């Protein structure tokens, strides 16, 4: 179950990006986060487990 593109996103988060250690004050966020939505009634919550 689940669309192909949705699975494509999942890998993108796990690898993650890079927090550039800026000498100049605060550094950069460098961290993406995903809000998982979609149609209910397909037991979606168990899938993400």
């Amino acid at each position: 179950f689940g669309g192909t593109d949705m699975k494509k996103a999942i890998a993108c988060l796990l690898f993650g990006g890079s927090r550039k250690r800026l000498p100049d004050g605060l550094t950069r966020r460098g961290d993406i986060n995903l809000l998982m939505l979609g149609d209910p009634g397909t037991a979606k919550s168990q899938l993400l487990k």
Binding site: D5, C12, F15, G16, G17, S18, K20, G30, D31, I32
Partner: protein
């Protein structure tokens, strides 16, 4: 099962890509067109972070233009997602104009029934919550007298 986990963490220690000075300047020209189409400002910050993962996945010591092509595929889904199913006059004016200038009587148009009126204005009950709960902060004279006196004193 466990073996596949460590491979993912393994690259995160290695590589550690950065922002390319020479390669980005040509890529920036693409963003200029992209910037034309708060949505726009957040986008570049968001996309760049995601693109950093692709370099990590392929041992890339810098960011290439092919990565941006992958970023387009992510935006393709988000394009429909932006519908949430742009206008300034529909938001604030419609609530203000029908408050007092429409109905001077004010009877039967209390807080318990004005929710029905919102139905005709194509406003869901969830959207009015952002409005109804914040009307006391607006400083409306009529709302505070109706809302606070009947809350406990009856």
């Amino acid at each position: 099962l466990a073996k596949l986990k460590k491979f993912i963490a393994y690259c995160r220690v290695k590589c550690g890509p950065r922002l390319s000075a020479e390669a980005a300047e040509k890529l920036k020209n693409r963003y200029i067109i992209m910037r034309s189409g708060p949505i726009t400002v957040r986008q570049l910050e968001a996309i760049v972070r995601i693109a950093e993962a692709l370099s990590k996945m392929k041992l890339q010591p810098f960011a290439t233009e092919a990565d941006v092509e992958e970023a387009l595929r992510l935006f393709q889904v988000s394009t429909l997602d932006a519908a949430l199913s742009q206008e300034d006059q529909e938001m604030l004016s419609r609530i203000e104009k029908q408050l007092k200038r429409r109905f001077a009587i004010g009877s039967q148009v209390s807080e318990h029934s004005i929710i029905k009126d919102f139905t005709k204005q194509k406003y869901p009950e969830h959207a009015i919550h952002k409005v109804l709960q914040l009307m006391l902060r607006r400083g409306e004279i009529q709302h505070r007298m109706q809302r606070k006196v009947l809350y406990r004193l009856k």
